[model samples]
Structure formats: C-alpha cells, structure tokens
Target: DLYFQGGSGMQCEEKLEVFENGFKDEKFNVEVKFYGNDARKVLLAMIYELYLPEYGREYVYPFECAKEFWNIYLEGEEIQDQLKPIKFTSEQVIKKLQEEIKKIKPPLEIKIEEAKIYKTKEGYLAVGNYFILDPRGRLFIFNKPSIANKILKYIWKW
Candidate 1:
C-alpha cells in the first residue's frame, strides 16, 4: 500500500524514498531498510537536482541546493561531473539520466552492494520527478504519474 509522495515532503529531512516498477507506475516495493540512510542521501541528491530548476528560481543560488545532491552521488566517485540539460527529446534525455544514475551505481550504505535502479528508463526519470522515501504513513495509499514530462520540460540540454 506504500507509494510515492516522498520528495518535497521529506525535504532535507535525512530520510529515504523508494520506487516501485517505475516512477510512472506504482506496482513494486522493496525493503529499503537494507539500503539504509546513505540511500536517503542519494535520493535526496536527485530530488533537489530536479526541483529547484524552476519553482525556486527566486533564489538563483539554488544550485547550492542542487549541489547538495551532487555531493552525495560523488561520495562514491571521482571529479564529480556536472549534470547538464538535454536539448534532445524527453525519452532520450530520460534514458540519458537513467544511464547517469546507473553509471554512478553509488555503493549504498557501504554494505558492499550498489544501489538498484528501480524503474525502467522513463520510469527511472519519473522517480526523480516524484520521489517518496519518507513513508510518513502513506505506505497504505496508492499513487499516479504522465508526470514523466515534468523533468523533460524542465532540464533542457546545453
């Protein structure tokens, strides 16, 4: 019964978000406790990465917030590359994003296992748009998405 709603609701609250089949579809759920808090850090990073680009435009320094996400993803890598917008179509961009997270494969919780890519390409992208790790009791509720276009419309390439 647990599904969606973690994102902004959790904020920088230091919790976690879990996705089912895909961000666009809510059918699968996993025992996130296995991933632990670092999992929370990673999800936090992606959420803010997509959020501040628009609504919070009032504070141009929100890249500061986006960087907060950047910081966690890189705790397991080098250089800490920048995530740019895609001038390309949504599907392609989503796929590209799917790859980015997949590539990072950030070693979750240092328990010796990397994180799992819960959703398909588009679904994966949807996860970023509608993140939900805080559980907060909605664990007994259902959810929805089309919503995939959310990030597509926002982060453009170049």
Candidate 2:
C-alpha cells in the first residue's frame, strides 16, 4: 500500500523541525509540478511565498524539503482585492486526509481551483475550508490557523 503521511503530524512546529532536519541531511527534496509550467520553478516560487512570519525559518530556509509531507496551500485569487484565500479549518481538511491516507496512488493529482470563505462571518466559525480540483491523493494543511484547535474542541464542521 502507498502510505499518505502527508498531513500535519503531532503539531506544526514538530513537523517543521522534521523538514529542517531532513533537508539538512539531504533526505528530502521538494517538487511542484504545475499544469502549465516547470515543476521545480513553480515549487521554488511557492516555497518563497510560504516564508511568512513564523512559517519560514532557519532550518526551513530552502523550504523545498517539506513539499513531500504537505500540500498546505495552493495559489488562489483575491477577494474584492482585499482578502486572499480563506483560512481552512482542520475539520474541513482532515476527513479527506484520512481517506487519502488509505489510498495507494491518488485517484487524481490535485490542483488549486479556488479558495473562498465558507461563511461570511469571521472569528473561528467556518462552514468549509477549501474547494480543491482533482482532489484525490494530493493534500493540504490550513495556511492560516496553525493550531489543531478543531480536534481539541471535539467539533466537526465539514
């Protein structure tokens, strides 16, 4: 069976440490295959964009090493030229992740179609997280909320 160890394991900080260590040891390599462009360049650019306040750090500088473990975000269009892709909640993204872990190969390689707010209100409420294209094997973690708060709350919104 093909293992899908692609979701956030333990905590985000721990996972990031693994990437840092693995990349330094030369055991990881990141790849981004775009439908219309070079995968390497595409991945590299995505890595750069991911370098946010705490997401990008010393052990994760190259950032390429972490690609194999997660598909946390895909490029999305702006909303009213104000908000970007909506923040995905763990409830919205985890069920599919569980199903993906059981598959050997992806039914279809995923691509980011669009990411919009599931609800109009802000705060911690959400009706859904993301709308993916060709979603089968590929995966993602929430780009905004870092904590696994949904799991702790014992609530599922998806």
Candidate 3:
C-alpha cells in the first residue's frame, strides 16, 4: 500500500498536529481557510496530484484510499444528502487544482499532461516526495508545503 509509514508517518503526524493546533498558535496568523473535512479532502487531492506520475503513462484511481477516506469524512456529517461521492479521477481532480494555479498572475507553469495515473508500490506517497513538473520538463519535488507556500505566498490570495 502507498500509505505513509516510518519517517513518513512522523511527518504526516506532524502536519496533522500543525493543523490541529494552527488556530491556537499565535505564530501561524493562518489565513488558509478549510474545515477539517475540507482540509483532509484537499490534502488527498494534492496527494493524487503528486502521485499521479506513479501511474507511468496511464491513469489509475486509488479507489481504495479514496473510498476509505471519504467514508470517514462522511461520518457524523448531516450534509451528506447534498454532496456527491468523491469519485473523481486523477485527471479530473488535477484539472480543478490547475484552475486555482492558473488564477495566479503569470500562473504556475505545470504540465499536467505529463503526469501518469497508474499504480505502483514505488510510487511516492511518502511525506517528502510531492513532485511537480515545469513546462521545460524540469522537476520540482518538495516534502513540505512550507517550501512551496513561501514562494507562492506573495501571489497566493487563498
């Protein structure tokens, strides 16, 4: 399974903790807005974006992980009737995220078409392996959001 473990487990725990305590921390002055469920969903969406390349030239949906996480999110929520099941493919999810990226001035230059969607144990689900590619095929991989966030912070309204 591509689930996080070991060092990755610690990093995942750390991020969760940061989110859990962010509202209370004076240091954060955090403006990123998201309900707990929304945050988890978004994190999963980001994971899908980063992991899409693991599919190696084909598209694969991680239904097992998606269904597991979505069911957990649906639990105790009364708004279930209005929402659809989280069944989007990687391409579908990336398109939505790419829209947000495009809204930035000059925008982020990414090539989503180069991303793959197949499955593999070697796939990068580890905490420090999120990878993005530029139009020139140059790759950018960062384990932590702070790195990307810092660069985008100037233009990031959201």
Candidate 4:
C-alpha cells in the first residue's frame, strides 16, 4: 500500500441562498421538512445540518441544545407559529454552528432510528435523514419538504 502522507481540501465558496430553503454540495443533497407547521424549527434543523462538517462535528438525537432546536420544534411545546422560515445565509449558519457546536453524524448504532447510512461509490448516504457521507464532493441540498418527508417515512417507516 502506498499510504503516502498527503492532503488537500476543497474551498467552499459560500454563495447567496441557493435553495430558497436548501443548500447543496456536489453528488449529495439534503432538505428540511417543516411539516407545514413551523418553519423556525425546520430552519434551525437546516442550518444545523447544513453547516456541519463531515467529521469533527457534534452529534444529534440524544440531548443538546442543538437537539433542543428540533425537540422544541418537533416536541409540540412550541413552533406552532404561522410564521415563516427565516433565511440564514452561509455566514449566519456558520456563526450558528460555532454557537451550537454540533450536527448530524452517522449514528454508531442503527437500533433506534433504525435507518442505516451506507457506503456508496462516491461516498455514503444516511437514508434516515437523507444525508451524505465523505464530504469530498460538492453537495446539492434543496427545499423539497414533501420529498424529504417522503424519503424519511418511506425508509424509516416512521
């Protein structure tokens, strides 16, 4: 095996809001499902998942304010507003990431969520959240709540 020591990185040029409610990288895509209820929670989820790095990032599904973002959003305590999804640019999202210190990671075990992330030719895919793995390629996350929900419900059967 070569096992040579070398490294390189793809500089992501943060551009204007591309997905209306979406973000993208080459070969991968993720979109948030607001559920026609509250956009704030979905927006927070979006920002949380979007700006997160492939590795060296925080985890979700247990307990964290980052998780709280969804808990309150999904738990039904709040986020019952008729308001709209507030747009947060890449800059704003990065700031939020710094503030929250977390994002989604392929779970260590696949018992609860029961959705497994699999390895792909180019990378991996988190069928549960419809996420991508190996952040080498450019991503293409978009705003398709119905589709997003559909994928999750179909895969997880939740």
Candidate 5:
C-alpha cells in the first residue's frame, strides 16, 4: 500500500524540494521515480488533464514516451529509457477501461487524456492519460484509451 500525507497542511509551509529533503532527513524510504525520470512530461500530462477544463481537453494513447517505460516496468524490471509509438483500437480501449475500473474504488471521477474528435469515429477518440478523483476527493492518474462521447454518456448515465 502507498501513503502520502503532505497534501493536507504541511506542504503549505515548505517548498516541494524542502519537503522532499525533510523526508530524506527523517530517513524515510523513498524512490523519486517520475520526478527524476520525466518531470516535465508528467506535468504537461497533468495540466492538460486537470487545468484545461475551460478549454476542454483530449487525451491520446500509445504515447511514445510512456509506452517505452511501460514495457520494462510491467514485469517488475528496470524501466528501459525508450518510448515507442503506439496506436489504439476499440477492443484495447475497452480492456484498459475494465482494468482501470477494477482498480479504482467507486464514485470515480477521471480527467482523461485524448478525448478529441476523430472524423473516423462518430464522437471523440480518447487516449487515456489523466487523473481520477474518488469519493473522498483524492486524485490519481490513469493511462488508458477513452472516447469523448463515452465520457458524456457516463455523465448522463450518472
């Protein structure tokens, strides 16, 4: 299980660097994974997902960079530093969504990546890379494929 606490009130008093340093000072076991590996890429992904509600956003899948790391990381192995281009199909999207839904606790609110309109499809094609807000208001990221109309479908269904 993972535990994170700084979001409550502590981070307000310290910069992220200082807070990270303090965690090290306390001899906590930590692995700075994404921050070191692809900080800007991750940040852009987050901003596009969370901060761009006014303009609306679309997510694309088979992101070249993330796909590269995924191959290595999936087997509990070292993450190889290479990304390959990936394309999405409808079946793959459904499977990914099922996997994600299984992992999440309910009342899920997700900010998905690629939800753009593709002329080939009736609605938008979604390439999932976004955050999920659970019933408790905690946020998490999911990398998958999604279609925009399905998102609207969900909104109406609920």
Candidate 6:
C-alpha cells in the first residue's frame, strides 16, 4: 500500500491536508511534517507520534487509527467517518485472541494453538514455542513478519 512517490508538485501538501483532516478533533495536535519527498517516512513518524500517550492522550486508540490510515491512504479504501468506543474484559480479550489465532495460517496457528497465558508483572503474557507477547500489549514476536500481519485481525476483534 501507500503509493507515495516524491514530486515537486502539490502532492505533499495534498497528503498533509488529508492527514490533518483525519485528525480534525481537538484532542489531536498534529504538526504535519513533509520531510523531503518520501511521504512514507513522514507517515511512519506521524504514526509513531500518535502512539505517545502524552500527545495522543485520550484521543488515540492506535490500532484503530493505524487501520484507518492504512485503509484510507495506502489501500485507497473508503472508511467510516466516525468511531465509537467499546469496552471488553480481560477474559473477553483472551477469548477473542484465541479465536483470531485460529484464523491465522500455520505455523503460527500451531504455535499459538498450544500457547499458555500467564500473568506477568507488566501485564499478561502469551507464552508459546514460537510466539510470545511481552506483558501488557507489547508483542515480542522476534523477526516473524506474521505477527505484524495479524495485529489488525485481532486488535479490533473485541
């Protein structure tokens, strides 16, 4: 996705306008950085900034924002105009994770199928032969790209 090609035209400005429009809510204080011509880096940095609890505050639900950004800007998909909040219990979260795991391709499917959930100091841990999530929500998936692929699948499931 994200067909960001560099040009001297108003493409950067247009992209910035779209990005700014996405964060029109007062809670988001975005300073769009059109660094050089590669819009990809700028977008990545913006996404990283959006994760900071201090800046994002109550406005950022990173998974949702990330999905929206990818779908709207990268995949050129039409998305909903607004978002609504939902709550879930820990049990519900684990149940959803299990359900999502079943939908993923193998060897991850095999690894997570027998995974064990543990209560850790940071938060909860899903310990498996190949996969492990380091407490809270910080997933420590090593170099496996599959982890990144499935985040969107399970993130908003609950």
Top candidate (lDDT)? 6
Best by TM-score: 5
What TM-score fits each model? 0.22, 0.22, 0.24, 0.22, 0.24, 0.24
Clashing pairs in 6: none
Tens digits of per-residue lDDT for model 6 on 41-81? 22333443435444343343442344455453432111111
In model 2, which regions exceed 4 Å deviation?
1-13, 16-38, 55-106, 109-158
Query: Clash pairs of candidate 2?
Result: none
Q: Number of backbone collisions per candidate, in order?
A: 12, 0, 4, 9, 9, 0
- Model 6's TM-score against the true structure: 0.24
The residue pairs found clashing in candidate 4 are 23-141, 24-139, 24-140, 24-141, 25-138, 25-139, 25-140, 26-138, 26-139
lDDT of 4: 0.30
Return the lDDT, model 4, position 150. 27
Q: Write the per-residue lDDT of candidate 3 for residues 1-158, one digit (tens) a residue.
A: 01222332212221221132111112222212222112333333333333345543233244224435345342112211111222334666557535533542222244444443322232211111233322221233333444334212211111
**What lDDT would each prediction earn against the true structure?**
0.29, 0.29, 0.29, 0.30, 0.27, 0.35
Candidate 6: segments with Cα more than 4 A from true spot: 1-93, 99-113, 142-158
By TM-score, the better pick of 2 and 5 is 5
Q: Candidate 2, residue 92: CA error in Å?
A: 35
> Which residue runs does candidate 3 get wrong by more than 4 Å?
1-37, 56-63, 72-158
Candidate 3 residue pairs that clash:
52-116, 55-118, 60-117, 128-143
Candidate 4's error at 33, in angstroms? 8.5
Q: Is candidate 4 or candidate 5 better by TM-score?
A: 5
- TM-score of candidate 2 against the unseen true structure: 0.22
Per-residue lDDT for 46-101 in model 5, tens only?
A: 22232234333333222222323233122211111111223544655545544444
Worst ten-residue run, lDDT, model 5? 16-25
